[PDB]
Structure formats: structure tokens, C-alpha cells
Amino acid sequence: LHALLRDIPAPDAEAMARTQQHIDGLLKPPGSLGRLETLAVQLAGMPGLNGTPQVGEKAVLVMCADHGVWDEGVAVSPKIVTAIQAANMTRGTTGVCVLAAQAGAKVHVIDVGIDAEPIPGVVNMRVARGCGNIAVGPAMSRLQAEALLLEVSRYTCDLAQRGVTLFGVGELGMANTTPAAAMVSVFTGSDAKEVVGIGANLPPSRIDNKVDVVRRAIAINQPNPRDGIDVLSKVGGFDLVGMTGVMLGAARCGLPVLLDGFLSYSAALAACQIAPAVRPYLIPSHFSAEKGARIALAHLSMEPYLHMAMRLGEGSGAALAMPIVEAACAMFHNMGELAA
């Protein structure tokens, strides 16, 4: 894993300069296409894209797992929903499946710790049947976190060999907005109250308990903010670790990864702490309606393209933004030049 982190390539400045020059000469007032121009240049610098903004196959990786903290009454949705929705993912009836199909992307459903029997059709990488309750101890051991990071990282870069050039990340796991809030609190130094949201329609009269659970997790585990793996293993979850792994893997592979909502922002905070070199490969999609979204995004210095007041998760936001990435590439390759 130390080798993996060490081998993440830096962006190719030469390709980026060539890209900027080309964009400036397109049939339009310089800089008029705003963030579409900056996105194209960002893509051009990613080594796995072969020196030019382009999109081949697309995939959304959905990390599924259960959390022991569910027992603290922080989620209104029954635990079983994780396994049910995971199976529905294989049937193509969920929100991310529908939006991915619209973008021409394939969805890969990965079980990294669902508390149920294995689901046929789902990629099996389970660590255990649900992680430990973070309210009374750690979610997992450091070794379990490192192993899952390496396994997911390798799976991700392996898809790159199959022609995938653009990844999207998503998750599925009842009660997962709790460990995500804890991680954001630790990495940004913000008080729990400022980052704890309603998740999946949690009643306002039940929020106080959620905020307390987050503070206890932090007080009992004392995760070290300067060690991303320490934070993930103590107050994260298997799904969060899995998402972090797609980010490390895509970066090692020199390819772009589209974020989703709040859960993915917490995983991105961890990935950037573990390896700052991952940052150049992350692309935001939408601005989550979750309470701690603004704080997380500020510490990542990211400004999402889409304001859809969405909070579904599953990677739906990432899928919705894929056409925007393809648009920047089409602009780059198909527009005429002022020269002619």
C-alpha cells in the first residue's frame, strides 16, 4: 500500500499547456466557456487519458456495507434495506442505475460488508457482516482498513485495463451519514452539531441523539486527524473505506473520479489526507443537500457543478455529471478555430 501511494503520478503539465493553448484558439471569446474549459485542461493532465481530454467507458462503483452504529437509533430505515437495495442494484431499478444507463455508464455493485447472506451478482469483497458500532469502539482494525484499501484500489485500476477512463463513486449502507459526519468533524475540526444532517429523512426530534452519538465516537476512539487511515478505521465504515479506495486506485491509474454527495466528500477528505497527490484526479458533481456539505467542500476547495438539492446517494450525482465531462471533451475536439 505504501508502494501504491508512492507511485501515484503527478499531473502532466506539458499536456495541460498544450490543452490550454488549443482551447484559447477555439471559435469563442477567450475563457467564455468558463468551468468547461478548466475541466478540459484538468482532464488533459491526467496520465491515464493519454494527453488529451477524452472519455471511453464509464463506470460507477457502489460500495455497500452495514454499520454497527445502526443500533444507536441514528437511522429510520430498517437495516435490511441495505441488502434489499443492493439486490435491486443488480436488477437496474435504482436511482443510480437509471441515471447511469442515461449516461451510458455501467454500475458495479460491491459488497464490502453487508450484514446478510451473499447476494448473487454482487462483487464480493466483504470484510465482515457490518463494521463495529463506532459509539463504543472502533469500526475495524487498521489492518482491515489497509487490506480493503489495497483490494479496492487494485480492482479499480484493473477496470482501467478494460477500457474504463472515468469513474464515479457511490455507497449504500443504512446509518452511514453518522460515521461520515464524525469523519468530517475530525478532519475539518468542526463541531458535530455543525455537520450532522437528517440523512434519510430522520425526524428533527431525533437529531440530538445523532449529534451525541457522533461526539461519543470521537471521544472514545480519539482518531488522529493527521492519519487518514486511523480516522477511517476508528470512526469510518467499510463503505467509506471502499470509496476512499476507488479514489486512491483511480489516482494511481492516472484517471478521473467523479464524487457524489456527503458520504463521498468524507471519503475524499480521508483520501487527500492519506495522499495529497490524489486531489488533482477528483471531480465534484453536485452540491449535496446534507447539512455538512458546505464545510466538507470548503476544506476540499471544491465547487460542485450541479445544484440539485439531492441527497439520495448511491452515486446518482456522479452519474448525472458524466455528460458534463463528455461535454468538455466534445468542446475541445469538435469546436472550430478562430484561425479559420
Task: Determine, following the binding rule CB under 8 A, whether residue 331 of this chain makes contact with a copy of itself.
Answer: yes
Give least dist CB 144 to a copy of itself, A: 29
- Residue numbers 299-318 binding a copy of itself by CB under 8 A: 303-313, 316
Angle in degrees, CA 74, 89, 101, rounded to 5: 125
Specify the stretch interacting with a copy of itself by CB under 8 A; choose among 45-53, 101-109, 215-223, 264-272: 101-109
DSSP character for 52?
S
Query: Which of 116, 200, 207, 220 touches a copy of itself by CB under 8 A?
Result: 200
**Residue 122 three-state SS:** coil
Query: Which of 49, 103, 110, 192 touches a copy of itself by CB under 8 A?
Result: 103
Residue (32 or 161) nearer to a copy of itself, CB: 32
Task: Determine, following the binding rule CB under 8 A, whether residue 323 of this chain makes contact with a copy of itself.
Answer: yes
Residue (89 or 152) nearer to a copy of itself, CB: 89
Q: What is the DSSP string of 139-180?
A: SS-HHHHHHHHHHHHHHHHHHHTTTEEEEEEEEE-TTTHHHH
Is 188 marked as binding a ligand? no
**Residue 111 three-state SS:** strand
* Cβ–Cβ < 8 Å for 19, 42: no
Residue (37 or 151) nearer to a copy of itself, CB: 37
Query: Which of 82, 85, 176, 233 touches a copy of itself by CB under 8 A?
Result: 85
Query: Which of 21, 161, 201, 205 touches a copy of itself by CB under 8 A?
Result: 201
Please give the order of strands across the beta sheet that includes 106-113.
Answer: 123-124, 106-113, 57-65, 164-172, 257-258, 282-283
Give least dist CB 4 to a copy of itself, A: 33
Which residue in this structure is represented by grid cell 455537520?
A: 195
Which residues does the annotation mark as catalytic?
A: 314
Site track for a copy of itself across 40-79, x = CB under 8 A? -------------------------------------x--
* Cβ–Cβ < 8 Å for 259, 265: yes
* Cβ–Cβ < 8 Å for 113, 67: no
Is 175 marked as binding a ligand? yes
CA dist list (Å): 34 to 16, 28, 333: 16, 11, 17
Say how many C-beta atoms besides its own lie within 10 A of residue 219's C-beta: 8
Q: What is the DSSP string of 211-276?
A: HHHHHHHHHHH---TT-HHHHHHHH--HHHHHHHHHHHHHHHTT--EE--SHHHHHHHHHHHHH-G
Residues that bind a copy of itself (CB under 8 A): 26-36, 77, 85, 88, 91-95, 97-99, 101-103, 200-201, 287, 289, 303-313, 316, 320, 323-324, 326-327, 330-331, 334-336
Annotated binding site: 85, 171-177, 200, 262, 288, 311-312
Annotated binding site for nicotinate beta-D-ribonucleotide: 171-177, 200, 262, 288, 311-312
Annotated binding site for substrate: 85
